[PDB]
Amino acid sequence: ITSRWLLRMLPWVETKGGAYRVNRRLTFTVGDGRVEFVQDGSTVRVIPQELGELALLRDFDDAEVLSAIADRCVQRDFRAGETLVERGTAADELHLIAHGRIGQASAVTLDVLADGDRFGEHALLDEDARWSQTATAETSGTLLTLSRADFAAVVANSPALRSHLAAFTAADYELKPREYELSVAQTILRVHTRVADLYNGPMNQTEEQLRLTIEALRERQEHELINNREFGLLHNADFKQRIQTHSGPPTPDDLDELLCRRRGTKFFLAHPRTIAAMGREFNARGLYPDHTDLGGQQVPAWRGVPILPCGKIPITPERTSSILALRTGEEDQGVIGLRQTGLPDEYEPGLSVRFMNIDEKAIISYLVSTYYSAAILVPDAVGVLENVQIANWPR
Amino acid sequence: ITSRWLLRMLPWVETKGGAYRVNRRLTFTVGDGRVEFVQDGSTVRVIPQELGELALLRDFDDAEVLSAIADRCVQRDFRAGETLVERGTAADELHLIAHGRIGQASAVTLDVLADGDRFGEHALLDEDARWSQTATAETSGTLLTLSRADFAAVVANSPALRSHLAAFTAADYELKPREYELSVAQTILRVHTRVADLYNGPMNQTEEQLRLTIEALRERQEHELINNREFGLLHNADFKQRIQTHSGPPTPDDLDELLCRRRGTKFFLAHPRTIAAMGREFNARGLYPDHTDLGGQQVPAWRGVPILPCGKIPITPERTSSILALRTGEEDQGVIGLRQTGLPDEYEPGLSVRFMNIDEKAIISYLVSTYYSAAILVPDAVGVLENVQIANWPR
Amino acid sequence: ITSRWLLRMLPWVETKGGAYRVNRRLTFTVGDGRVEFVQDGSTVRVIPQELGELALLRDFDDAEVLSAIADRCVQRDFRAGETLVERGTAADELHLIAHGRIGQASAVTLDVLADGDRFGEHALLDEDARWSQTATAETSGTLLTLSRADFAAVVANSPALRSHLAAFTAADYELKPREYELSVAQTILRVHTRVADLYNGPMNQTEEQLRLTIEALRERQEHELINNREFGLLHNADFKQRIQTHSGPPTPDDLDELLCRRRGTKFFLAHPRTIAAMGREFNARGLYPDHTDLGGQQVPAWRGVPILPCGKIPITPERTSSILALRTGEEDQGVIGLRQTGLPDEYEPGLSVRFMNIDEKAIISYLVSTYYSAAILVPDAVGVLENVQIANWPR
Amino acid sequence: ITSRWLLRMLPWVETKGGAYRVNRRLTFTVGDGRVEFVQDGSTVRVIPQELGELALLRDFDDAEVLSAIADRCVQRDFRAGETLVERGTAADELHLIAHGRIGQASAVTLDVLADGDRFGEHALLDEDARWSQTATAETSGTLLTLSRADFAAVVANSPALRSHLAAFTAADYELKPREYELSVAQTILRVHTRVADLYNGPMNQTEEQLRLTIEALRERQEHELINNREFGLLHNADFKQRIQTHSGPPTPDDLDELLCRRRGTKFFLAHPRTIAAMGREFNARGLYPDHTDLGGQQVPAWRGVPILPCGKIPITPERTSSILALRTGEEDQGVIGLRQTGLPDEYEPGLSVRFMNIDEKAIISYLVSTYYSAAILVPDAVGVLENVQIANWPR
Amino acid sequence: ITSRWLLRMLPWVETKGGAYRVNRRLTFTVGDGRVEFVQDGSTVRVIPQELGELALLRDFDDAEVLSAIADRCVQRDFRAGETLVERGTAADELHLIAHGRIGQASAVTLDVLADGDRFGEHALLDEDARWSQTATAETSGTLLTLSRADFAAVVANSPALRSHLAAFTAADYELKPREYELSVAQTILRVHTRVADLYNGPMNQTEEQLRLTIEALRERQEHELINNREFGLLHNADFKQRIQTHSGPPTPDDLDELLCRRRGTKFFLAHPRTIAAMGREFNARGLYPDHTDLGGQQVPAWRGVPILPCGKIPITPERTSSILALRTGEEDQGVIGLRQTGLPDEYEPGLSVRFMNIDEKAIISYLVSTYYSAAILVPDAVGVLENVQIANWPR
Ligand SMILES: [Ca+2]
Ligand SMILES: [Ca+2]
Ligand SMILES: [Ca+2]
Ligand SMILES: [Ca+2]
Ligand SMILES: [Ca+2]
């Protein structure tokens, strides 16, 4: 029953056969100290060529072997404040950081590793390796793990790798298409036969129940478009596009930085609590931003970019939310809504209601279905500002 | 003779038979530590299922018994600074807080209870119970009271309750329609026959007196729409929608919070003194808000939402007022004005003037009547910011 | 030759017979500690019923006697810093404050009396009464005086008053119409016959002298509309509508307060020096108010209400001026300009130039006349902010 | 080649016979301690009646004598920091201050004399008079000087003056028209005959040289309109209209004061360096002024009054400039541009190019001439803010 | 694939024969202590007449000799922090500063030389000369060098110079046209014959590859227009138009100064990181600049001048960038884009794709060519703000 801004702002394109294909270019250079990954929503995997940045694997350029080694790592997720390794415990895993920041405290907090960093190199070769620093995850993120035993097995598999390891001991174009499959929001509406036979003259309680069902389906559509793992702007956004606040509250400097990272930003999406926090920051700074009109409707904006409320963005127990800056379009590579119309029996252009059966208890069943998905044409189309403290007040 | 903004901004819908029906959904979950209530204007009553949050009544799920227990509590109102219970006095009542904040000072101010809180649990079971804290009401509000004797009587009534109590000693959907009945503003206009016979050529003093009567009736309509107890935005507003100022003056952060709680806010209603206080806060913060045009009329606004003056909002002796943020509409669930037109003898579409009789003293009597009421379709349509200090000046 | 904003903004209505009638309602309640007065421009008189607030006259309700007592008081005006009574001097007068603030310093400045206050009660009864405080007028204002001898004479006149005094010793509706008489701005233009006979071909020096005469008459019209005593916005404004600045400079908080007191304010009138002071305050506060267009002409405004310069508002030697906030209209009760057109011989719709005579010295005389006045339909139509310090600069 | 704002904004009126007449009213009252002067550009002369403010000449009212005495004073100009008189030197001159401020330091800086002040009274009568204070000119200005010998000669001329002096020893209307004569910007363009015979097919180097000549003439026109002594806004502006900055940088308070002194100001003229300084002050104060559109062209403005750049306003070696606020028009008494069109041989409506002769060296000569002047109808049409420090930066 | 603002904002003019001619006037006066240079992109050369400011060459006015001496100097570039001369090392070179600032530290940092300064005079005459100060280049710039031996050779060449040197020992107009030659962006597109024979029905992969080639060519066009040495706004901008920030971050005062130096500025060009830094400065100052619409597109602006992002402006390792303020036009002397259309075989108005050959390996080759250049009609058309710190955050 709430306002659905993402549904009415994202353009909808018609897929054929319930599938879509997006061609991805992944530019990456070796030697720069950062490992680049391939991300498919929430599932991530290291680029096989990038894997060569590791010294113990430098100058090895057999595509088969690198691909196998890349395939044998395991993805793990860590929450804020969770301890991953502890000082004193023997080291047996190589950790490649894909997202988040992790502060390492030695026996003296050395520094904080971030996206593209590695720790655990020496643990791979010798069995005497011991963790001398404690890594505490300051921010939630992902991390790839390469076990010593698996790499040893791969070494015992390829003779070329043995010889290269024994000898050492003494812009790249990568095309890989991404396939999007239409997800379904489905439900069963059970209407008693009496309610369909009698209550049908001045208003249809069947039609009113169907409208309520459609509204619930649309709310689920928005919640999935925001929070789903395979597709979904919160999770299926490039790791480089996700920024951290300088101080924690959503100061206007953070909004300027969020607008810096991409061209032609269309709008901001944030929780209403987050919008209140941004307004508090604006009042503290003493500036009054203008409001712009979209569709004959006035809306708060920053630098002319409208800020739209979305209640489906989660609020963490620590009262920290996130802000999304995103451009929409097909001619300009942005975010599109994949949706198939022309269904066999449409109550609405995107909907399909079909009579299922009548039970022995005289209850008619209807199947209400809609098919939807989201596509991001280029990586630099959605930026996310994370860990935004929304419970800060002037003191 | 003053401007009537609420009369000209609230849409008016035609009721049939002088009555209206509003369907209410009351979502509530058990175990979360807050008791949810059903509010009909100023009269409040505890939800029978919510009553189960009490430990001494946990796991009892007989609808009849819970309904009876809920029916046997008494609603009481407390003003700011009034002491409800005192330390040392024996405890004999269970108090469930429906609105307001109450600070409890022990023998050391422990904390402040708020809406949905309970105190007086142990007073229900044993007669030795004694109040060890003094509860001072910092803000005016309501409170439900459950006496020990009444609960004991209910226990002596239901055998199932006795057995459950003896054993312990060792999202829910609730539909309940709300009915609105049209209220009447009526008056008698006494015009002497001489004034109707002679003073009728160039101007009608009868018609001028009728216009003055109509203006007085409209002023009474506004005062009732604001301050009435059964219906009326000040009292018939959800307890969750009523917020307290962070500091006491109406700072722009408070306005941002007031706009946060509901979607598509239409306008603000405040006393002109309150508007002056808000302007003083704006000048202190150094920001100059824009002004928007409604009906070809310029008006001060915040974030594009016009702020309309209403002199019918009371000012307390402590010089504290309240602000109302409210959206209006029928297609969008908001606040509507129930009014019946097509009266038997209409001087105006909503009015009815009828000749009553002529007295022995040659005085003609006229009956001027109008029928009006207010409906709030959804709970999240009117928000109230309370205890707004309007007598604060820079120092 | 200057811009005449009041002439071009005040609507002009046509009076019949050179007179106008305004019906006044004066609501007043007894017992509230303030005495209400009837004001006709600069002449003020106490309401006879209000006079009952005095204890020594409480419960006396003979209309004739109260009217007589009210008629026998004398109005006096006091300037800022003038001492009215001195400590030690015997008290013989009862003083009722109608306007201004007066600080009383005892043998220790007790407090400051204001509009509606009384001091000198006991001086009325006994002859031993002595002034024990010195009253210094901090602000210019008026004051009603009731002498002991006059009240004693009235007592000796009415037997009922004697009995009531001897016994004690042991919302009201009052209609009183106000009549406005059109004032005249007149002058005599003396043109030599030679100047009318010769200098008439390419330009008329007679017509140029007439235009200069008309401009002088219009300037006098504005000066009288502002500064006249009988009519005139500066003096014929309600004592409750006149406010004092919180600090002395015209801070924007003062403008907000000035806009608070009345509905639908049309514009502000202030001296250009006052406008410069307001701009200095705006710059100090750091806010830049918008400008609005009236008649295709841009003008500075506050909260959308245009601020118009008027050089006829006096500047005191202490460099303190006043600001006027006023709404104009006839359908909305405000300030109207009474003016009669259709004169026997009109050079202009409101003007009348008539040949008088030719002197023996061959000098033609012309009489240039215009008739004008101002009416204030309701008391809450003109508000005045007084003692505005306009010579304050940042330091 | 630069933008010429004054040329395109000043209205141009056609004079007849190359001359214009402006009628001046000079209101002045005696006894107020200030001497009023008549200014014709840069040449100033004391009003004969005002001369009576001097005590030694009080009550003498012979028009011939006063006119003679007024005629026998000499005008002198002083720069900032220049010492005019020194302590110890015998006093022999009476100095009347027409413009600027001069600080006098005694044996202790007494005070600062300003426009309309006098010093050197006693030096006129006795020969023993000695300067006991040193007068240092803080600001550039003018000063009238009356020598003792000249006044003594005038005394020896008029018997009436002798008798009046011997006896003492024991609003006025003054019309005086101002005549404006059109100035000429002239030049000679020498084009070789070969350049006129050959280089004439695809483009005319003769026509290109003529366009360059016209541009140079227009630049000279602007420089004279700004900086000329007889006419010219910088010098031919009323001494009362010239203000001094409160602090030295062009703070917005100074702009408000500049707008205070005259009605209907059209625009500001300042050097681009001065505009940069004003922008720096605006940024320091934290306010962002709006921009207005004239002729479809956006331009910075203050209070809706556009600020136009003019590079012809001089910058002193001390990096101090001046700002001009001026209204333009003929129906509203302001600043007009006198210019005669319809010349015998016009290349442009205001221009005249005429063939002069061909030299023996086969060089054709052309005479390019334009006639222009400026008129100020009323004294209060141009205000000048002087000694504006434009080299101030935040520290 | 990024937005190309410079391509769509610069007007394009059609050159004839692939060449353009710009007539330059170089006004310079002798004796003012600054040497003026002639700049052709990145190549600079001293004006021969200006060379006379040197004392050892004063009063020598033989054009041939001065031209020869000017021709025999060598241009050198210095980076920030690079030491050019060291104390103690013998002096053998005369250094004329053309751009940048160089701080000289003696045995005590004396001062900082800047554009037009000279150091090394005495090194020219005697061989005993020794550097007594160390010159450290605080900012990158250019510098002309005149060796002692070369000047001695020129002296031994001209007898007149010997005599003038022996004797001493005891606004100018200079026209020099600038020629612009069109540069070419060329590439070869290799398409396999199979891809051209089969993949041609529903979409042409040949046409898609051609579009990608065109986009790459346009990106190279922008990068050359910004960063090229011969032409290019960053390098081919007048040395007087290049300003240094007062503090280092791009404060609004710096933008005001950048707008001060030229008339009718069209737009600003800066890196998106620089735009973020400017927004941070605006938020710190507390002012919110307006946004203007160009081509129906909203864009941030300062004082109404739009600020356009350009990613081709380099960012130094010290995180310092530059800002460009530039006006565009042909009728108003500014920056124009030289481009020739009407090519023999145009895929696009400015493009030319031509079939080259088919290789023995059945690979078709296409030649994609475009011709472009940039012209700056007057020196005061592009201003550059340099060393702008873009990594500054509030602390
Ligand atoms: Ca890499
Ligand atoms: Ca609950
Ligand atoms: Ca009273
Ligand atoms: Ca005088
Ligand atoms: Ca020079």
Side-chain angles (χ1 to χ4, degrees), chain C residues 101-119:
Chain C
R101 314 172 54 72
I102 58 178
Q104 38 196 22
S106 73
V108 186
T109 307
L110 294 195
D111 36 31
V112 51
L113 310 187
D115 39 346
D117 283 318
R118 339 162 283 181
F119 73 90

Side-chain angles (χ1 to χ4, degrees), chain C residues 27-36 49-51 53:
Chain C
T27 279
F28 67 102
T29 73
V30 48
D32 51 324
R34 28 200 60 76
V35 186
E36 291 256 354
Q49 297 96 325
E50 278 283 351
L51 197 46
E53 296 199 0

Side-chain angles (χ1 to χ4, degrees), chain A residues 1-3 212 272-273 276 279-280 283 286 288-291 298 393-395, chain B residues 25 246 252-254 256-257 260 263 285-290 302-304 333:
Chain A
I1 207 66
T2 69
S3 62
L212 263 73
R273 223 162 152 192
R280 288 205 296 281
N283 305 330
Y288 189 80
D290 258 349
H291 287 37
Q298 48 99 341
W393 279 84
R395 273 317 186 282
Chain B
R25 306 181 226 279
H246 201 84
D253 300 17
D254 302 343
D256 284 299
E257 183 83 356
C260 163
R263 144 191 61 81
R285 301 299 181 279
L287 50 149
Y288 189 80
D290 258 349
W302 178 249
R303 308 300 192 196
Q333 296 110 42

Side-chain angles (χ1 to χ4, degrees), chain D residues 161-206:
Chain D
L161 180 46
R162 268 173 244 102
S163 88
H164 194 308
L165 292 213
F168 156 75
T169 317
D172 294 28
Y173 215 96
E174 188 196 38
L175 298 135
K176 29 181 58 174
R178 208 204 184 280
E179 199 88 352
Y180 294 97
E181 287 299 348
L182 253 51
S183 284
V184 64
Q186 256 192 353
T187 205
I188 312 176
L189 174 71
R190 314 178 67 72
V191 171
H192 207 289
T193 319
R194 170 167 183 130
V195 200
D197 283 338
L198 312 179
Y199 307 86
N200 199 4
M203 160 166 137
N204 294 21
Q205 188 159 80
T206 296

